[PDB]
Every structure is written in structure tokens, then in C-alpha cells.
Design a protein around this ligand. Structure first.
Ligand SMILES: CC(C)n1nc(-c2ccc3oc(N)nc3c2)c2c(Cl)nc(N)nc21
Length: 913
């Protein structure tokens, strides 16, 4: 109807492409995805409608909570005998007259307990209810809700007060928590009923098993079209092919004969070393058109195909695959990690293929057929004699699992993901697979030890994975990267995340989880259904889910998958679509303005450029579009009226806009009265996004281990192709800005923190400096200098502009070299700043911080591994990630690692360590 057409227009504006473009995609996988995904949409809407209005309020305003209620000892020691002082505000009279009520209560208090105490202090005024009616009709703890003053953050669930990230932050930073008491009905009325409507597309020979096909794999290469090249630069061309399971070949590569580029017609049946029943479920045909002019081979275009379609059917008949351009840094002739499926641009090289025909629809076997076969294999193997078992190292006799074997398996499991498992160890792991069930964490290594080109082994692995004990969400995440293409394996990983991944951790790891969707074979899978359900049942997850997917819509490798996924999100997210559309339009106006300043007005004064900007922004359509919406950096932050006098074009290349909005919140003064965001169009912000995530994780590790090293992982969000937002840090200046001699910085902090507050400032400087020193050395971050190092007024040091990481200077560098300026502050003025107790203490923070990250090395290795899928230049292979194996000295021992870290610091600083 009329309502549907309007919804399609809204969805089209949000995703940046019209819905009709999907309707004309004839691929049944695309159409089946659009229809079948609506199950998740329905399920999510039903959970939100379950406890209306409360459950709808929990979707819109989910509790911003820490994963564990348990508090670290040093954070508990900041409290006054485990008690927190909280200020509770009440707006009385419509002239918004504010009334504060300071409460001293236990940190573990639940919001309703906090509301009751505030009522008691309010009742202390009309002290007639001291004894008589002391209860005050339950003291209406369920008629009110607590809100964070200055932003749209609510305390709707029964968590201990300290578990809310705001209060934990207030405790850690020694800040007074300011909460606003609000009526429940006042919040519920704001929330509309999102009555989800199903779209109009919801309304829309013989079969033989794969294993009953006694035949080797053959694939016919017919010809290519749109092969437009130089026959001066090229002598002859051929099609290179291979059969892969992830990035691992399942047999040797097969090439066609050489043909001139003038007539690319092979019509050749390529014969592969693989029995059709031994084809694993995630088996793919990887191909490329190459040129040869010793001789020099070179890929022209590449393409990957799943040998089984989304319905478990083995590919048959004729097929045409539109190829992709070679990405720079392609070492092999084939690109097996690359995207599977046809290039959406049909004006690209197009190879015509033909698969075998068996006079019937060949389907991958049912789990009952796999279980029957696995039980057959296990029982047959159990029956093998001493001599028979002797014929293979992949066959082990029972009563031949010594305490040495068990301890060797445990030692192999502790090894990092980037550690090579030798063929000897692979046979060993596989032969002892049943013992491996008792060490659940060994699963990634056992899975890499399986012969994926053997149905007998894979069928048994399937049964082991089915009854495999649960592993930690962080351990499970590794099983979703490019090394693990099997759907049974990935399904187990998703099931671990479903059971053990909290909303806090899902938000923290959302960038990785969105990335690994790209390594899925099909549009409809367990992972996407897990992510979409969570996005549609938690608006804080949904917000970033949308922006992460929207930011990569310009990439044609993921545009269809992300487009279709975004469409399903927008159809079911509810009222938030209209709020996202405000953000989308505000960003579009900013992209369009910044493009005009880079193109049209590049060669103009800042004064002149600002004159154009102010004139253009003050147009009624622009002015409205650019004010009165939610911050894409943090949607709890409302961006009110634009303070044009506070806005400015920054004197940097890319011409970033320093933007300022009023905070329209009633109690904006208690948090921040103005929201300052940097809009940058020109720079790829994905590397900074990853570094900022990692920095936050590193900080969390140190804080839990009782190491108070304060970091500053400021907000950074990529919203498109080299476009995004950066959070401004209030009251901070670069080392260059301070410099107005070596004592300049120390004197500046003395001036900013005189008297009894001086010692706290030096301590905060040293602790933050120690954290950044260790973080930057491990991650191989871009060279530090006076303009990319910043210091807050309170003494908090932090870094900006990461840009590059790891082995970017292509022999392990120290990005943050502590000049005498930093050392003088550390040593409280002392000239001999190396030979001081303050420096010795600072070194011990660096050593403890270094080793703490060494302890969590598999996490960081895994987080980087899951990000190989994104087209980041600095993160293109597992050898790039191997930089953190060097900086962390993983092969070396803990004491040898400290000696390594010390040596690097000693050489960089020219003594001291
Ligand atoms: C040059 C100066 C005005 N400045 N520049 C950035 C900045 C600008 C772009 C950035 O890009 C990245 N990745 N970090 C950045 C940091 C920045 C921040 Cl966050 N906070 C404050 N208080 N001042 C800042």
C-alpha cells in the first residue's frame, strides 16, 4: 500500500540505494534471503512487544553495563568503606527548577534502592513521615526511573549501581555521579508502538546423494568475454583454477592451455585430484585469467565459486562468472581468500564454465547420513589390529595415550594461533581427537589437523563438533575467521556466542563480527541471524550494526550482502529508522559541503572558506538537516542547535570540520553543554578504529589486573569511503601547543595543577605515559611527535592520529620515544631524570603492562585475524599480524621477553633501560 511505498523510500534513503534494485535481482538466493530472514525480524519484534512498555524501553534504552558485577580491589579502595556518594536531581515546577539530593549508599545498590533513599531525603524536608507512613506507599521505587544527567542513558534493569559503565567511570575518575529522577510514564509515552508490517515480497529432476557418485572432479572451462587488454604487453593467456577449503587447497592447481587474447576459447575439461564424495561442504572453485610473456606469469582477473549452492546442491550445467580486478599485493596467481560470487558490474571479464552432469540433482548428505558414516568409521577404527593401526600415523591404538602424550597435547593447545602446527603434530592431534574433547580449547588446532578432503575424517569431525563442549566467546571468535570455512565449525562458534557473549562484549567486538560475515559462503547463515537478532533487540548494538554495514556499502565485494542485510534491519528496527535517516542526511550534507571545499573552493583563505560554509549551512533545508539529531559517535548524545561561531574549518589537509552543537538535555550543564565533533572527509579511519578498540581492551586488561594505567580510547567512527567522525577531547592540547626548553611541559603541568593536586597530576601523567609507551611499542603505531601526542589539563597523556600499525615501516621500532620533556615531568623536575625512584617506578609500570598484554596475546592476534577481511593496506596477511608475535616475544620466555622489551627501550632512548 501507500504506507509500504513510503517505507521503501525511507529504507532506500538509509541504505543509500533504492529497494527496487533488490527486487530486480533474479538470483533466488537473494530473494530467498529477503523472504526467510523475516523470521528473525518477527522474533525480535515479539521479544520487544513481550513486556510492553518496559521491554520496548529496554530495546531503546538498554542498560550500559559492564560484563561482571565484581569490582577490582583498587577501584573498591576509591570508595568510602564500599560506599558511593551519588547526587540525585528532581525537576520540580515547569520552570525546570532543579533540586539536588546527595546520597551516601553501597556501590552494589540497585536503582530501586537508590530511588527509595532519594525519596527518604526528599521526605526528610516534610519530616512528618519520619515514623508515621515511613513506607510512603512502597516509596514509589517502581513509579520512577533513573537517568544520567546530560544524556539519554537510563537505569531500567536491576543491576548493582557500580555495574553501570557511567558509575564505574565516575568511581575510577573520582567524579560525582549526577542522576536525574524521572517518572516511568514520562519515558514510556516518548516511546512509540512500532507495529511491524511484512513486506510484499514475503507473500511470494530426481535427487541423488553426493556420496553415491563414484567419480573424480572435472570442470569445463568454455570461454571468456570482456577480455580487453594490450597484445603488445601480453604474449598469451590461460585460466588458472584450484579447489579450496578456505585458503587451503584440496588438491593441486590445474591450468588450461595457452590461447591468444584475441580469441579466449579453451573448451577444456580440467581434471582435479579429488573424489566427488570427498568434496567438503565449504569446497570452492577458485579461478583467474592469467597472462604469460624464465617466463613471467601474472593474474589479470580473478573469481571464486562455491561448488555447492545455498540449498546444498552441487553446481551443475553451464555457469558464467564475472571476474574481479587484482588487488595490489597479490602474490599468488589465485585469490582464494577473496569474495565468492559474480562481480555485480557486468562490464568486466566474464568466464563461461560448465560443471558435470549426473542426470539428477546432487545434494550434500543429511546429518543422519553423516552420523551413520562417522559411527561406521569410529567402530571400524576401534576394531583395527596393532599392525593395521601401524599403517598410518593418523590411526592410534587405545591404551596408547601415555601421560607424555596428554601433556604434549596440552602444550600444543597453549600455543598462539599464529604458531605453525607441523604435519607430525597434525597426525598426532587427529589420532588423539577423542582425548582432545577433555581439552576443549584445543579445537582450533584439531580442526586445522583434519584432512578436509577426506569424507571419513570430516564426518567424524562433524560428530565431534556436534558434542563438543563450550569454549569462551573469545576462543570461539577465532573459529569465525578465514581459517575456518566449515559451516558445522562456524555454527558451533555462533552457538558459543549465543550462549556466552554478553551485550557489552558483543558491542566491543562488533567490528570483528561484522567483518567475518564476509567470510560466510551464503547470505542466510547462523552468524547473520545472530547479529541481526541482537541488532533488532538492542538499539545500541543496532545503531553501530547499521553504521558499520553502511560504511562499506561503497564496496561492491560486500554491497549486495550488506545492502540486503541493512534492508531487513530497517524493515524491523522500528522508529529508530527515522532517527538514523536524520543522521544519514546530516552526514550527506557534511560530505557534500566538504567535497565542494576540496574541489571548488580548495584555493581559498580560511576566512573565505568559512564565509561560503556559513552561507551554505544557513540555508533552511541545510540548517535543519544539520541540527536536531543523535550523534552517530554515541546515540545517547542529542545534537541540538549548531553553534556556527564555534564551528571552524581546521588548518589541515583533508580540511576537517570542527563542529559544535548545543546539548539540548535539560541538565546539559552537569555533563557537557556543547558537543564537539570533528568531521573528516579524505582519510581512511578504519586503522584508527581498530587501534582505539585495542587500546580500550588493553586498558580493561590492565585495570582488571590491578594496574591503574588510564588510556584515552576517544570515539572514532567510519561512516563511508574515507569519511567519518572523531570525538573531541575537552581541555587537551598537543605537546607543540604547550611549547610557548625541556622543562616547558613540566612547568605547564605545575601551573595547571598547583598545590596538593600536583602529585596526582604527575601520577596521572606517568601512568598514562606508561600505558601509551607499551601500547604503541606492541602495535607498531605510526611515529610519534609533538603534534600527535596530547596532554589534558589534569595530566592525562594520550595519542591521536594512529594511521598505520604493525610492520608498516617494513628492526622492531619504538614509536613513542620519551624525550627529556616527558622524563622531567615523570621525575618531578629533577635534571638527573634517569637515575630517580619515579623513573624506576615508571619502568615497573611498563614491565607489568608489557607482560599483562603478553598474557592475552591470543585475543589480540584473533582480533587482528578477524580484520584481514577488511581492505586495510597495513593488514593484508598473517605475516603482518606476526609483528605482534615479535614485539610480544611469544617464542621467548617471560624473563627473556622483559629483557627484549628493555633492550628495545634502551636502544631507542640511547640508555636508561
Ligand atoms: C588538531 C587538534 C585540534 N586535534 N586534532 C584531533 C584529531 C584529529 C583527527 C584525528 O584522527 C585521529 N585518528 N585522531 C585524531 C585526532 C583532536 C582531538 Cl581527538 N581532540 C582534541 N582536543 N584536539 C584534537
Amino acid at each position: 500500500n501507500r504506507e509500504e511505498k513510503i517505507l521503501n523510500r525511507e529504507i532506500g534513503f538509509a541504505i543509500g540505494m533504492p529497494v527496487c534494485e533488490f527486487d530486480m535481482v533474479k538470483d533466488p538466493e537473494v530473494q530467498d534471503f529477503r523472504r526467510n530472514i523475516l523470521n528473525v525480524c518477527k522474533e525480535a519484534v515479539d521479544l520487544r512487544d513481550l513486556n510492553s512498555p518496559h521491554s520496548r524501553a529496554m530495546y531503546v534504552y538498554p542498560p550500559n553495563v559492564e560484563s561482571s558485577p565484581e569490582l577490582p580491589k583498587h577501584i573498591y579502595n576509591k570508595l568510602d568503606k564500599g560506599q558511593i556518594i551519588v547526587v540525585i536531581w528532581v525537576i520540580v515546577s515547569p520552570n525546570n527548577d532543579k533540586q539536588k539530593y546527595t546520597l551516601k549508599i553501597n556501590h552494589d545498590c540497585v536503582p530501586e534502592q537508590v530511588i527509595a533513599e532519594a525519596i527518604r531525603k526528599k521526605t526528610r524536608s516534610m519530616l512528618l513521615s519520619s515514623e508515621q507512613l515511613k513506607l510512603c506507599v512502597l516509596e514509589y521505587q517502581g513509579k520512577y526511573i533513573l537517568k544520567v544527567c546530560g544524556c539519554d542513558e537510563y537505569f531500567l534493569e536491576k543491576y548493582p549501581l557500580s555495574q553501570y559503565k557511567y558509575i564505574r567511570s565516575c568511581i575510577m575518575l573520582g567524579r560525582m555521579p549526577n542522576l536525574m529522577l524521572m517518572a516511568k510514564e514520562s519515558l514510556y509515552s516518548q516511546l512509540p508502538m512500532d507495529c511491524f508490517t511484512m513486506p510484499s515480497y514475503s507473500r511470494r529432476t530426481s535427487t541423488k546423494s553426493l556420496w553415491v557418485i563414484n567419480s573424480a572432479l572435472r570442470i569445463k572451462i568454455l570461454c571468456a568475454t570482456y577480455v580487453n587488454v594490450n597484445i603488445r604487453d601480453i604474449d598469451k593467456i590461460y585460466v588458472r583454477t584450484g579447489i579450496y577449503h578456505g585458503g587451503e587447497p584440496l588438491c593441486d592447481n590445474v591450468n588450461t592451455q595457452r590461447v591468444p587474447c584475441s580469441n579466449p576459447r579453451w573448451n577444456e575439461w580440467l581434471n582435479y585430484d579429488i573424489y566427488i564424495p570427498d568434496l567438503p561442504r565449504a569446497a570452492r572453485l577458485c579461478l583467474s585469467i592469467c597472462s604469460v610473456k624464465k617466463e613471467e606469469h601474472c593474474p589479470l582477473a580473478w573469481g571464486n565459486i562455491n561448488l555447492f549452492d545455498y540449498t546444498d546442491t552441487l553446481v551443475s550445467g553451464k555457469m558464467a562468472l564475472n571476474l574481479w580486478p587484482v588487488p595490489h599485493g597479490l602474490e599468488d596467481l589465485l585469490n582464494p581468500i577473496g569474495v565468492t560470487g559474480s562481480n555485480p558490474n557486468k562490464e568486466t571479464p566474464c568466464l563461461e564454465l560448465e560443471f558435470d552432469w549426473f542426470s539428477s540433482v546432487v545434494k550434500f548428505p543429511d546429518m543422519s547420513v553423516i552420523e551413520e558414516h562417522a559411527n561406521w568409521s569410529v567402530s571400524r577404527e576401534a576394531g583395527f589390529s596393532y599392525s593395521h593401526a601401524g599403517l598410518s600415523n593418523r590411526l592410534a591404538r587405545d591404551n596408547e595415550l601415555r601421560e607424555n602424550d596428554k601433556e604434549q597435547l596440552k602444550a600444543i593447545s597453549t600455543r598462539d594461533p599464529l604458531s605453525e602446527i607441523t604435519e607430525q603434530e597434525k597426525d598426532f592431534l587427529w589420532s588423539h581427537r577423542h582425548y582432545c574433547v577433555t581439552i576443549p580449547e584445543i579445537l582450533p588446532k584439531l580442526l586445522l589437523s583434519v584432512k578436509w578432503n577426506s569424507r571419513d575424517e570430516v564426518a567424524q569431525m562433524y560428530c565431534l563438533v556436534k558434542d563438543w563442549p563450550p569454549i569462551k566467546p573469545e576462543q570461539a571468535m577465532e573459529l569465525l575467521d578465514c581459517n575456518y570455512p566449515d559451516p558445522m565449525v562456524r555454527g558451533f562458534a555462533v552457538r558459543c556466542l549465543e550462549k556466552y557473549l554478553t551485550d557489552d562484549k558483543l558491542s566491543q567486538y562488533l567490528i570483528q563480527l561484522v567483518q567475518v560475515l564476509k567470510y560466510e559462503q551464503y547470505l542466510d547463515n547462523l552468524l547473520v541471524r545472530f547479529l541481526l537478532k541482537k541488532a533488532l533487540t538492542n538499539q545500541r548494538i543496532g545503531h553501530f550494526f547499521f553504521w558499520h554495514l553502511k560504511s562499506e556499502m561503497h564496496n561492491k565485494t560486500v554491497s549486495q550482502r550488506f545492502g540486503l542485510l541493512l534492508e531487513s534491519y530497517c524493515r524491523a528496527c522500528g522508529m529508530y529508522l527515522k532517527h538514523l535517516n536524520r543522521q544519514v542526511e546530516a552526514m550527506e550534507k557534511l560530505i557534500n559541503l566538504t567535497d565542494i571545499l576540496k574541489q571548488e573552493k580548495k584555493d581559498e583563505t580560511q576566512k573565505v572558506q568559512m564565509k561560503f560554509l556559513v552561507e551554505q549551512m544557513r540555508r533552511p533545508d541545510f540548517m535543519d538537516a544539520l541540527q536536531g539529531f543523535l550523534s552517530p559517535l554515541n546515540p545517547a548524545h542529542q545534537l541540538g542547535n549548531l553553534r556556527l561561531e564555534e564551528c571552524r574549518i581546521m588548518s589541515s589537509a583533508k580540511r576537517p570540520l570542527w563542529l559544535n552543537w548545543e546539548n539540548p538535555d535539560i541538565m546539559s550543564e552537569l555533563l557537557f553543554q556543547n558537543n564537539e565533533i570533528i568531521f573528516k572527509n579524505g582519510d581512511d579511519l578504519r586503522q584508527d578504529m581498530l587501534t582505539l578498540q585495542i587500546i580500550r581492551i588493553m586498558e580493561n586488561i590492565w585495570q582488571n589486573q590491578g594496574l591503574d594505567l588510564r588510556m584515552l580510547p576517544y570515539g572514532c567512527l567510519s561512516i563511508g569511503d574515507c569519511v567519518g567522525l572523531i570525538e573531541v577531547v575537552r581541555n587537551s592540547h598537543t605537546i607543540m601547543q604547550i611549547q610557548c626548553n625541556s622543562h616547558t611541559l613540566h612547568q605547564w603541568l605545575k601551573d595547571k595543577n598547583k598545590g596538593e593536586i600536583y602529585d596526582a597530576a604527575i601520577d596521572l601523567f606517568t601512568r598514562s605515559c606508561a600505558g601509551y609507551c607499551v601500547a604503541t611499542f606492541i602495535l607498531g603505531i605510526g611515529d610519534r611527535h609533538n603534534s600527535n601526542i596530547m596532554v589534558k589539563d589534569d595530566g592525562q597523556l594520550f595519542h591521536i592520529d594512529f594511521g598505520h600499525f604493525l610492520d608498516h615501516k617494513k628492526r622492531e621500532r619504538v614509536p613513542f620515544v620519551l624525550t627529556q620533556d616527558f622524563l622531567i615531568v615523570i621525575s618531578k623536575g629533577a635534571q638527573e631524570c634517569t637515575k630517580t625512584r619515579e623513573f624506576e617506578r615508571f619502568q615497573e609500570m611498563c614491565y607489568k603492562a608489557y607482560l599483562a598484554i603478553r598474557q592475552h596475546a591470543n585475543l589480540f592476534i584473533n582480533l587482528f585475524s578477524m580484520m584481514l577481511g577488511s581492505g586495510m593496506p597495513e593488514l593484508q596477511s598473517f605475516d603482518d599480524i606476526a609483528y605482534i608475535r615479535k614485539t610480544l616475544a611469544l617464542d621467548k620466555t617471560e624473563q627473556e621477553a622483559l629483557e627484549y622489551f628493555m633492550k628495545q627501550m634502551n636502544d631507542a632512548h640511547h640508555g636508561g633501560w
